[PDB]
Design an enzyme around this catalytic site. Structure first.
Site, PDB file in Angstrom:
ATOM      1  N   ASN B  95      -8.448  96.134  78.777  1.00 23.99           N
ATOM      2  CA  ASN B  95      -8.746  95.783  77.410  1.00 23.99           C
ATOM      3  C   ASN B  95      -7.702  94.937  76.656  1.00 23.99           C
ATOM      4  O   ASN B  95      -8.072  94.232  75.730  1.00 23.99           O
ATOM      5  CB  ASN B  95      -9.087  97.090  76.660  1.00 23.99           C
ATOM      6  CG  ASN B  95      -9.304  96.925  75.177  1.00 23.99           C
ATOM      7  OD1 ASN B  95     -10.261  96.307  74.739  1.00 23.99           O
ATOM      8  ND2 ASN B  95      -8.371  97.392  74.387  1.00 23.99           N
ATOM      9  N   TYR B 159      -7.148  81.299  75.199  1.00 25.38           N
ATOM     10  CA  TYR B 159      -7.855  82.581  75.202  1.00 25.38           C
ATOM     11  C   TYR B 159      -9.137  82.440  76.052  1.00 25.38           C
ATOM     12  O   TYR B 159      -9.345  83.199  76.991  1.00 25.38           O
ATOM     13  CB  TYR B 159      -8.184  83.008  73.767  1.00 25.38           C
ATOM     14  CG  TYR B 159      -9.062  84.237  73.677  1.00 25.38           C
ATOM     15  CD1 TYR B 159      -8.520  85.519  73.785  1.00 25.38           C
ATOM     16  CD2 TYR B 159     -10.436  84.123  73.491  1.00 25.38           C
ATOM     17  CE1 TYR B 159      -9.324  86.656  73.695  1.00 25.38           C
ATOM     18  CE2 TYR B 159     -11.251  85.256  73.394  1.00 25.38           C
ATOM     19  CZ  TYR B 159     -10.689  86.518  73.481  1.00 25.38           C
ATOM     20  OH  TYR B 159     -11.495  87.628  73.358  1.00 25.38           O
ATOM     21  N   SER B 160      -9.938  81.406  75.749  1.00 22.69           N
ATOM     22  CA  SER B 160     -11.177  81.066  76.427  1.00 22.69           C
ATOM     23  C   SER B 160     -10.946  80.790  77.913  1.00 22.69           C
ATOM     24  O   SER B 160     -11.698  81.292  78.746  1.00 22.69           O
ATOM     25  CB  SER B 160     -11.826  79.880  75.719  1.00 22.69           C
ATOM     26  OG  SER B 160     -13.179  79.735  76.110  1.00 22.69           O
ATOM     27  N   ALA B 161      -9.869  80.071  78.258  1.00 19.89           N
ATOM     28  CA  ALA B 161      -9.518  79.808  79.665  1.00 19.89           C
ATOM     29  C   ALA B 161      -9.233  81.107  80.406  1.00 19.89           C
ATOM     30  O   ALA B 161      -9.678  81.278  81.542  1.00 19.89           O
ATOM     31  CB  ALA B 161      -8.303  78.889  79.751  1.00 19.89           C
ATOM     32  N   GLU B 197      -9.101  95.236  62.696  1.00 24.78           N
ATOM     33  CA  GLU B 197      -8.093  94.738  61.764  1.00 24.78           C
ATOM     34  C   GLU B 197      -7.588  93.350  62.220  1.00 24.78           C
ATOM     35  O   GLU B 197      -7.511  92.426  61.397  1.00 24.78           O
ATOM     36  CB  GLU B 197      -6.924  95.739  61.721  1.00 24.78           C
ATOM     37  CG  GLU B 197      -6.115  95.700  60.440  1.00 24.78           C
ATOM     38  CD  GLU B 197      -4.844  94.874  60.455  1.00 24.78           C
ATOM     39  OE1 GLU B 197      -4.827  93.794  61.087  1.00 24.78           O
ATOM     40  OE2 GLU B 197      -3.883  95.278  59.762  1.00 24.78           O
TER      41      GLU B 197
HETATM   42  N1  LIG Z   1     -12.292  92.128  68.004  1.00 26.21           N
HETATM   43  C1  LIG Z   1     -13.169  91.212  68.397  1.00 26.21           C
HETATM   44  O1  LIG Z   1     -13.850  90.550  67.609  1.00 26.21           O
HETATM   45  C2  LIG Z   1     -13.349  90.905  69.863  1.00 26.21           C
HETATM   46  C3  LIG Z   1     -12.569  91.506  70.788  1.00 26.21           C
HETATM   47  N2  LIG Z   1     -12.768  91.262  72.184  1.00 26.21           N
HETATM   48  C4  LIG Z   1     -11.909  91.868  73.196  1.00 26.21           C
HETATM   49  O2  LIG Z   1     -11.595  93.211  72.879  1.00 26.21           O
HETATM   50  C5  LIG Z   1     -10.259  93.510  73.346  1.00 26.21           C
HETATM   51  C6  LIG Z   1      -9.472  94.162  72.235  1.00 26.21           C
HETATM   52  O3  LIG Z   1      -9.928  93.601  70.982  1.00 26.21           O
HETATM   53  P1  LIG Z   1      -9.145  94.051  69.632  1.00 26.21           P
HETATM   54  O4  LIG Z   1      -9.240  95.593  69.671  1.00 26.21           O
HETATM   55  O5  LIG Z   1      -9.625  93.260  68.466  1.00 26.21           O
HETATM   56  O6  LIG Z   1      -7.604  93.589  69.581  1.00 26.21           O
HETATM   57  P2  LIG Z   1      -6.400  94.473  68.996  1.00 26.21           P
HETATM   58  O7  LIG Z   1      -5.275  93.510  68.605  1.00 26.21           O
HETATM   59  O8  LIG Z   1      -7.137  95.292  67.993  1.00 26.21           O
HETATM   60  O9  LIG Z   1      -5.688  95.399  70.099  1.00 26.21           O
HETATM   61  C7  LIG Z   1      -5.222  94.796  71.328  1.00 26.21           C
HETATM   62  C8  LIG Z   1      -4.304  95.766  72.030  1.00 26.21           C
HETATM   63  O10 LIG Z   1      -3.471  95.058  72.984  1.00 26.21           O
HETATM   64  C9  LIG Z   1      -2.133  95.504  72.839  1.00 26.21           C
HETATM   65  N3  LIG Z   1      -1.238  94.454  73.316  1.00 26.21           N
HETATM   66  C10 LIG Z   1      -0.942  93.269  72.691  1.00 26.21           C
HETATM   67  N4  LIG Z   1      -0.116  92.503  73.358  1.00 26.21           N
HETATM   68  C11 LIG Z   1       0.165  93.237  74.500  1.00 26.21           C
HETATM   69  C12 LIG Z   1       1.045  93.012  75.584  1.00 26.21           C
HETATM   70  N5  LIG Z   1       1.813  91.921  75.706  1.00 26.21           N
HETATM   71  N6  LIG Z   1       1.149  93.983  76.521  1.00 26.21           N
HETATM   72  C13 LIG Z   1       0.419  95.095  76.380  1.00 26.21           C
HETATM   73  N7  LIG Z   1      -0.450  95.413  75.414  1.00 26.21           N
HETATM   74  C14 LIG Z   1      -0.525  94.439  74.493  1.00 26.21           C
HETATM   75  C15 LIG Z   1      -2.006  95.876  71.362  1.00 26.21           C
HETATM   76  O11 LIG Z   1      -0.959  96.822  71.068  1.00 26.21           O
HETATM   77  P3  LIG Z   1       0.611  96.610  71.133  1.00 26.21           P
HETATM   78  O12 LIG Z   1       0.865  95.583  70.033  1.00 26.21           O
HETATM   79  O13 LIG Z   1       1.120  97.993  70.680  1.00 26.21           O
HETATM   80  O14 LIG Z   1       1.062  96.195  72.479  1.00 26.21           O
HETATM   81  C16 LIG Z   1      -3.351  96.555  71.130  1.00 26.21           C
HETATM   82  O15 LIG Z   1      -3.309  97.950  71.437  1.00 26.21           O
HETATM   83  C17 LIG Z   1      -9.685  92.205  73.905  1.00 26.21           C
HETATM   84  O16 LIG Z   1      -9.716  92.137  75.328  1.00 26.21           O
HETATM   85  C18 LIG Z   1     -10.570  91.138  73.259  1.00 26.21           C
HETATM   86  O17 LIG Z   1     -10.663  89.937  74.008  1.00 26.21           O
HETATM   87  C19 LIG Z   1     -13.817  90.433  72.602  1.00 26.21           C
HETATM   88  C20 LIG Z   1     -14.587  89.831  71.719  1.00 26.21           C
HETATM   89  C21 LIG Z   1     -14.407  89.905  70.255  1.00 26.21           C
HETATM   90  O1  LIG Z   2     -16.381  86.914  69.980  1.00 30.16           O
HETATM   91  S1  LIG Z   2     -15.393  85.855  70.406  1.00 30.16           S
HETATM   92  O2  LIG Z   2     -15.950  84.884  71.411  1.00 30.16           O
HETATM   93  N1  LIG Z   2     -13.959  86.494  70.840  1.00 30.16           N
HETATM   94  C1  LIG Z   2     -12.985  86.772  69.855  1.00 30.16           C
HETATM   95  N2  LIG Z   2     -11.819  87.286  70.281  1.00 30.16           N
HETATM   96  C2  LIG Z   2     -10.757  87.637  69.331  1.00 30.16           C
HETATM   97  C3  LIG Z   2      -9.777  86.465  69.074  1.00 30.16           C
HETATM   98  C4  LIG Z   2      -8.790  86.834  67.922  1.00 30.16           C
HETATM   99  C5  LIG Z   2      -8.077  88.211  68.130  1.00 30.16           C
HETATM  100  C6  LIG Z   2      -9.013  89.364  68.617  1.00 30.16           C
HETATM  101  C7  LIG Z   2     -10.016  88.924  69.726  1.00 30.16           C
HETATM  102  O3  LIG Z   2     -13.192  86.502  68.497  1.00 30.16           O
HETATM  103  C8  LIG Z   2     -14.321  85.898  67.949  1.00 30.16           C
HETATM  104  C9  LIG Z   2     -13.966  85.193  66.616  1.00 30.16           C
HETATM  105  C10 LIG Z   2     -12.986  84.030  66.862  1.00 30.16           C
HETATM  106  C11 LIG Z   2     -13.591  83.027  67.856  1.00 30.16           C
HETATM  107  C12 LIG Z   2     -14.197  83.663  69.140  1.00 30.16           C
HETATM  108  C13 LIG Z   2     -15.077  84.907  68.873  1.00 30.16           C
END
Ligand SMILES: NC(=O)C1=CN([C@@H]2O[C@H](COP(=O)(O)OP(=O)(O)OC[C@H]3O[C@@H](n4cnc5c(N)ncnc54)[C@H](OP(=O)(O)O)[C@@H]3O)[C@@H](O)[C@H]2O)C=CC1
Ligand SMILES: O=S1(=O)N=C(NC2CCCCC2)O[C@H]2CCCC[C@H]21
Ligand SMILES: NC(=O)C1=CN([C@@H]2O[C@H](COP(=O)(O)OP(=O)(O)OC[C@H]3O[C@@H](n4cnc5c(N)ncnc54)[C@H](OP(=O)(O)O)[C@@H]3O)[C@@H](O)[C@H]2O)C=CC1
Ligand SMILES: O=S1(=O)N=C(NC2CCCCC2)O[C@H]2CCCC[C@H]21
Lengths: 265, 265
Positions: B95, B159-161, B197
């Protein structure tokens, strides 16, 4: 809207992985078109022979710079030098790959890392260094990919990962250049099996499929890049671009821009 | 077959990026279900809070190991330690992502390499390290992705890559696991915008779109992974899995196996 070889006369072109295969074929076509070429691969002798043949074929100029695309310093410095040799750049052909063998993925991290570095990271390095020159000339970038960069198949997990990454990175760049009104085009070339020695050797006793000729493949890459097409499909089956073209993704991408603040662009 | 939370009681689950967002929510849902969890993220303090709440929620056991996923040694050793803690592993949830802001592409190579290592290479390291334990339990892997891992949109080229590379790698592993009769499933979770957030802050003033709730998102990932689905689409629009699903790639992947020599597997 129809390609003419004169579109490449006196143009300043870079071809990576130019010592053999599709790369060598592209250098030859470009040379017959009267383009200026700068070629690269690890093989000095292989590059010397291609440059010499290019000069014979009518290239406006031909130079080689040898090195490994596993070194990001060489990749970037190669662009700077190639640009200085020609006094600009019209087209960048990112064609090279690192050595890949077909095998079920098994405890093979080191190969994923080197593959991602050569096949993807050096492409980012070179397109970044080349962009200011391409912007000045309203240039083009050809990004060489495969069916395995649009679908999956057993035995090529590292390679497929790197080609999928190229699509994700380069399709975002294409859209960003388009929406910001920068006249630089990005052509992703989705190639089926090609009859180069490398591809034929690597599939021997593993995959039995029909190959397409390397000469024609090379011409299609150049034509599609010159014509500023977003994608070029080159395979024996006429069904391949229909089945790999993904019209759903294209619909989603069109509507995607509606959600953005226009001021960002 | 329908998902029943009772399926996960007593199960041994790893959650990465579990200190906040959807990762934290997934830890809570698993805890409520009575699973054993091992959580990771960089924040020791953040993980301590989630672990205590997990215990209050009814987790069979809850532990954390803090570290950075930029370090491949930590990525691998974490899997080994997590395994020792629970005495095995049933489900691995990948994740975590690096900090991601929206901007028209302008990063240097060090920044793109960091995205590729955290978002991609570490998932490959962990899935590879966890495989002996997942093979022993007939376990599962959830690979968290997004709409940007199936189509492109501006301002997130690295990110996309990284998300495209995950589709490329894991879809190949899935097919290899299938053809070799290994009962380890791989679920690619293609998520739309989620009300976390981080995601809400990052899009502020850039994108105006409907977000989906974080706790339902979390459950949908758990349900699909437990059900051993190849892909899970989670977004507000029902058009999303229809338009991103790519039936054409599926047709090609099906016909692709016929070109291969059976003896290679
Ligand atoms: N929110 C959205 O709109 C979307 C989210 N996603 C996917 O969901 C997943 C999580 O989303 P979201 O919950 O918003 O993101 P968050 O920023 O809410 O949480 C991401 C987590 O990754 C940890 N993290 C960050 N950098 C590192 C690192 N270098 N090493 C280890 N852990 C790390 C953070 O904690 P810490 O800083 O304590 O390390 C945190 O616990 C991702 O894979 C994202 O691509 C997909 C589509 C849309
Ligand atoms: O649903 S997504 O394709 N993935 C994401 N991923 C996030 C990118 C920003 C930090 C949390 C994950 O966000 C959406 C809004 C910004 C553009 C892409 C779309
Ligand atoms: N052939 C095919 O069936 C298909 C090919 N493609 C794509 O076509 C492109 C070229 O294919 P193809 O001509 O078959 O392959 P070749 O092996 O024929 O040539 C690849 C080139 O890369 C160079 N090269 C190898 N390793 C490195 C390195 N570390 N640093 C720099 N240069 C390197 C080689 O030169 P030297 O060894 O001297 O460095 C060579 O000139 C690739 O992008 C490939 O993915 C896509 C689909 C099918
Ligand atoms: O047409 S492809 O998708 N790309 C390639 N790329 C080659 C992979 C091996 C080295 C040369 C390039 O080959 C075909 C045969 C092996 C499986 C994939 C298909």
């Amino acid at each position: 809207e129809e390609f003419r070889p004169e579109m490449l006369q006196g143009k300043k072109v870079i071809v990576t992985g130019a010592s053999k295969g599709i790369g060598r074929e592209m250098a030859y076509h470009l040379s017959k078109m009267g383009a200026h070429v700068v070629l690269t691969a690890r093989s000095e002798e292989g590059l010397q022979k291609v440059v010499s043949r290019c000069l014979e074929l009518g290239a406006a100029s031909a130079h080689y710079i040898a090195g490994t695309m596993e070194d990001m310093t060489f990749a970037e410095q190669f662009i700077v030098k190639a640009g200085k040799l020609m006094g600009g750049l019209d087209m960048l052909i990112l064609n090279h790959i690192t050595q890949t063998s077909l095998s079920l993925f098994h405890d093979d991290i080191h190969s994923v890392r080197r593959v991602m570095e050569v096949n993807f990271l050096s492409y980012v390095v070179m397109s970044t260094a080349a962009l200011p020159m391409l912007k000045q000339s309203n240039g083009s970038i050809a990004v060489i990919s495969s069916l395995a960069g649009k679908m999956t198949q057993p035995m090529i997990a590292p390679y497929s990962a790197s080609k999928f990454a190229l699509d994700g990175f380069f399709s975002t760049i294409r859209t960003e250049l388009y929406i910001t009104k920068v006249n630089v085009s990005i052509t992703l070339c989705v190639l089926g099996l090609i009859d180069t020695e490398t591809a034929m050797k690597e599939i021997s006793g593993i995959i039995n499929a029909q190959a397409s000729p390397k000469e024609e493949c090379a011409l299609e890459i150049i034509k599609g890049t010159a014509l500023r097409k977003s994608e070029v499909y080159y395979d024996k089956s006429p069904l391949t671009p229909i089945l790999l073209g993904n019209p759903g993704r294209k619909i989603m991408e069109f509507f995607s821009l509606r959600y953005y603040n226009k001021d960002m662009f």
